[PDB]
Design a protein around this ligand. Structure first.
Ligand SMILES: *[C@@H]1O[C@H](CO)[C@@H](O[C@@H]2O[C@H](CO)[C@@H](O[C@@H]3O[C@H](CO[C@H]4O[C@H](CO)[C@@H](O)[C@H](O)[C@@H]4O)[C@@H](O)[C@H](O[C@H]4O[C@H](CO)[C@@H](O)[C@H](O)[C@@H]4O)[C@@H]3O[C@@H]3OC[C@@H](O)[C@H](O)[C@H]3O)[C@H](O)[C@H]2NC(C)=O)[C@H](O[C@@H]2O[C@@H](C)[C@@H](O)[C@@H](O)[C@@H]2O)[C@H]1NC(C)=O
Ligand SMILES: *[C@@H]1O[C@H](CO)[C@@H](O[C@@H]2O[C@H](CO)[C@@H](O[C@@H]3O[C@H](CO)[C@@H](O)[C@H](O)[C@@H]3O[C@@H]3OC[C@@H](O)[C@H](O)[C@H]3O)[C@H](O)[C@H]2NC(C)=O)[C@H](O[C@@H]2O[C@@H](C)[C@@H](O)[C@@H](O)[C@@H]2O)[C@H]1NC(C)=O
Ligand SMILES: *[C@@H]1O[C@H](CO)[C@@H](O[C@@H]2O[C@H](CO)[C@@H](O)[C@H](O)[C@H]2NC(C)=O)[C@H](O)[C@H]1NC(C)=O
Ligand SMILES: *[C@@H]1O[C@H](CO)[C@@H](O[C@@H]2O[C@H](CO)[C@@H](O)[C@H](O)[C@H]2NC(C)=O)[C@H](O)[C@H]1NC(C)=O
Ligand SMILES: *CCS/C(Cc1ccccc1)=N\OS(=O)(=O)O
Ligand SMILES: CC(=O)N[C@@H]1[C@@H](O)[C@H](O)[C@@H](CO)O[C@H]1O
Ligand SMILES: *[C@@H]1O[C@H](CO)[C@@H](O)[C@H](O)[C@H]1NC(C)=O
Ligand SMILES: *[C@@H]1O[C@H](CO)[C@@H](O)[C@H](O)[C@H]1NC(C)=O
Ligand SMILES: *[C@@H]1O[C@H](CO)[C@@H](O)[C@H](O)[C@H]1NC(C)=O
Ligand SMILES: *[C@@H]1O[C@H](CO)[C@@H](O)[C@H](O)[C@H]1NC(C)=O
Ligand SMILES: *[C@@H]1O[C@H](CO)[C@@H](O)[C@H](O)[C@H]1NC(C)=O
Ligand SMILES: [Zn+2]
Length: 499
């Protein structure tokens, strides 16, 4: 019987109690990263994250930091491999910058052979060290030209352009890459990029944020989400019909969260909690497993929710070999009004729920996840059991899918000096507490999880936060980004992997 801790202090940092041997022999352990966050603009065209961070510096991060140079993985990709080698990692998730291989967006406009070579070198290097690549085709960095031509994912033209880009990736890298992720965190761009405008491209309703150049927070998130599903499905169909000889697998990336009732004895809170599962997870999982949006979304969103044609429904349904599940935290849900007529209405309001980290009786869900200096009441807290609940839910609700945890991690303040940043015991606690529960859910619920990739191989530009927070298991000095030095967490993970 496996017992896992939910509150501080944690004792899972002892590799004598918890290690890779606790999992199946073939279980993959590694770390993850994304192109915009680690490469730098050198050698690539411009994308919407360059555009967004430059047009709206205040939105790039409190420090106005962006991905211009960041940790310079373009030049130091070998150093990334060295970190993985040091960790004895068996997996590495990275993303291909569309702007690096097709700077002009549309494939017919030509490709960047040097950009293609960059990824060939990285992939060859990973394989030579026994590291299995998990490659994300689209980690939000859409070529700026496509956003300017037709507003990217807001238009159906994105489908063919994404398909042609994916085709190039399969053609060029598919002989070596056997695990593909289509779109990173399906929920994110529709809501943050077209709803709240916290993320690129930065579209929203005029009253939601006067700085948005255009948009409609009430309708656009649904249009974008719909196109993401269609684009994703078209790419999966292309992969399975034209690249089956490669013997690989492909799937979407979902940002997952668990939800608990703000008040577990209040039917309204309980209902809001179930609505959140449907609006947050079901919005994409319903189409992916059934070819239709959840009924509660159909009923609530009405005319603002696009419909799948019979052909599209068939294309989207079952469009995955596995699911890349990112997991960070869990929230309490309570009822909230949905003012559809208000000029400030956002798609996020349709769920009719308010999310918190403290419940009705004043209980904080778990240890501190992220401290918000602007407002103490806006602090995020984590919940280790959430990963168990999410995996159990996916197996029972979404037809026992093959799963790879594609992201799981925690940040530490950017204000900390080198020594403080290196002594990241809070990260060991976060990682081990989640790994305990992941092992527990695999054994108790038989969830088909075959890999775990911790977020951020190293410190990098964090979307919306600049360099004010660090997520890496390895430290990076912003005055000399060459070195990737394993922090206490990286050293612990090394021992966890090879006890
Ligand atoms: C997994 O996918 C399944 C489909 O492959 C889902 O089952 C479908 O669920 C639909 C509801 O979402 C359901 O469609 C409704 O059908 C009603 C009856 O239509 C028949 O009878 C009519 C007689 O007058 C006739 O005119 C029709 O031609 C049909 O013969 C219909 O009245 C409904 O329309 C109203 O409600 C919808 C909102 O749901 C409104 O959009 C619409 O304007 C109207 O107000 C509705 O029809 C749909 O209307 C919208 C239109 O775009 C669609 O083309 C049209 O179908 C449908 O019958 C079933 N199909 C099957 C195979 O059972 C399944 O849904 C779950 O299970 C069903 C049974 C139901 O309980 C749902 O609530 C569940 O979510 C999906 N499962 C999951 C997990 O989501
Ligand atoms: C988690 O949710 C539950 C269920 O909603 C909360 O319990 C309910 O708390 C209500 C108070 O907010 C209770 O209603 C009140 O009852 C007293 C006594 O009769 C009455 O004088 C009040 O006017 C009020 O009555 C309601 O008034 C509005 C009407 O629409 C409604 O029909 C009336 O009932 C309610 O009875 C109670 N339900 C039950 C079954 O216990 C719960 O609140 C916490 O516990 C209750 C018992 C009370 O001590 C609250 O102060 C306390 O916050 C809530 N838990 C938390 C931590 O928020
Ligand atoms: C976002 O787009 C929606 C849809 O075009 C707008 O909602 C429409 O608003 C008009 C004017 O009040 C109504 O006549 C329609 O019935 C609404 N459509 C539906 C069914 O929602 C909404 O006003 C737009 N929001 C902003 C801020 O531009
Ligand atoms: C807020 O969360 C706390 C902690 O999960 C809940 O408290 C638990 O409630 C159960 C059921 O009454 C008890 O058996 C446990 O002993 C409680 N644990 C603790 C730490 O006190 C509490 O019920 C939640 N509040 C609401 C309104 O849902
Ligand atoms: C890549 C982070 S986006 C995310 C998870 C998260 C981590 C730290 C702080 C805030 C969020 N979830 O994406 S979304 O659910 O916010 O769209
Ligand atoms: C208050 C503040 O400092 N934030 C402003 C914001 O109000 C403004 O809409 C935006 C214009 O792009 O520029 C930000 O710096
Ligand atoms: C790994 O953890 C298990 C408990 O799950 C323990 O029995 C084993 O001794 C540990 N391995 C090492 C080498 O510490
Ligand atoms: C597979 O490739 C062929 C050759 O380019 C193409 O004709 C066909 O449409 C492709 N199948 C798809 C789009 O899945
Ligand atoms: C506008 O939206 C904001 C954010 O949800 C809300 O706080 C405010 O009350 C709304 N104003 C209106 C029109 O009620
Ligand atoms: C930058 O760091 C590298 C690796 O530690 C080192 O070799 C080089 O001398 C440093 N350059 C500076 C800033 O002096
Ligand atoms: C790396 O892991 C393999 C497989 O568990 C093990 O045989 C090998 O000794 C490890 N290498 C190091 C130096 O940890
Ligand atoms: Zn710049």
């Amino acid at each position: 019987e496996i017992t896992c801790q939910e509150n501080l202090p944690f004792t899972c940092g002892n590799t004598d109690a918890l290690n890779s041997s606790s999992f199946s022999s073939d279980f993959i352990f590694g770390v993850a990263s994304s192109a915009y966050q680690i490469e730098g603009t050198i050698g690539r065209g411009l994308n919407i994250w360059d555009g967004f961070t430059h047009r709206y510096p205040n939105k790039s991060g409190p420090d106005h930091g962006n991905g211009d140079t960041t940790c310079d993985s373009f030049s130091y990709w070998q150093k990334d491999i060295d970190v993985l080698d040091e960790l004895n990692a068996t997996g590495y998730r990275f993303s291909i910058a569309w702007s690096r291989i097709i700077p002009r967006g549309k494939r017919s406009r030509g490709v960047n052979e040097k950009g293609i070579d960059y990824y060939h070198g990285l992939i060859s290097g990973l394989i030579k060290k026994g590291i299995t690549p998990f490659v994300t085709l689209f980690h939000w960095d859409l070529p700026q030209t496509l956003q300017d031509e037709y507003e990217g994912f807001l238009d159906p033209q994105i489908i063919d352009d994404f398909k042609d880009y994916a085709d190039l990736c399969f053609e060029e890298f598919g002989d070596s890459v056997k695990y593909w992720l289509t779109i990173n965190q399906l929920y994110s761009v529709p809501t943050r990029g077209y709803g709240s405008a916290l993320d690129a491209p930065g579209r929203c309703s005029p009253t939601v944020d006067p700085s948005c150049y255009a948009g409609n927070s009430s309708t656009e998130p649904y249009i974008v989400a719909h196109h993401q599903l269609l684009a994703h499905a078209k790419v999966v169909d292309l992969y399975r019909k034209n690249y089956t000889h490669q013997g690989g697998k492909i799937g979407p990336t979902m940002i997952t969260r668990w939800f608990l009732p703000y008040n577990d004895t209040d039917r309204h809170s309980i209902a809001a909690t179930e609505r959140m599962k449907e609006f947050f997870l079901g919005w994409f999982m319903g189409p992916l497993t059934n070819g239709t949006y959840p009924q509660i979304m159909i009923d609530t969103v009405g005319e603002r929710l696009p419909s799948f044609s019979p052909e599209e429904s068939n294309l989207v349904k079952g469009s995955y070999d596995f699911l890349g599940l990112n997991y960070y935290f869990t929230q309490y849900a309570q009822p909230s009004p949905n003012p559809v007529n208000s000029t400030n209405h956002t798609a996020m309001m349709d769920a009719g729920a308010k999310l918190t980290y403290i419940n009705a009786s004043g209980h904080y869900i778990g240890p501190l996840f992220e401290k918000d200096k602007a407002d103490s009441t806006d602090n995020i807290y984590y919940y280790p059991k959430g990963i168990y609940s999410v995996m159990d839910y996916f197996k029972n609700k979404y037809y026992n899918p093959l799963i790879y945890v594609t992201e799981n991690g925690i940040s530490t303040p950017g204000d900390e000096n080198r020594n403080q940043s290196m002594l990241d015991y809070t990260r060991i606690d976060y990682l081990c507490s989640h790994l305990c529960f992941l092992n527990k859910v695999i054994k108790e619920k038989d969830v088909n999880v075959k890999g775990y990739l911790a977020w951020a191989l190293g410190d990098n530009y964090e979307f919306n936060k600049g360099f004010t927070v660090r997520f890496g298991l390895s430290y990076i000095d912003w005055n000399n980004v060459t070195d990737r030095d394993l922090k206490k967490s990286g050293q612990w993970y090394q021992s966890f992997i090879s006890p």
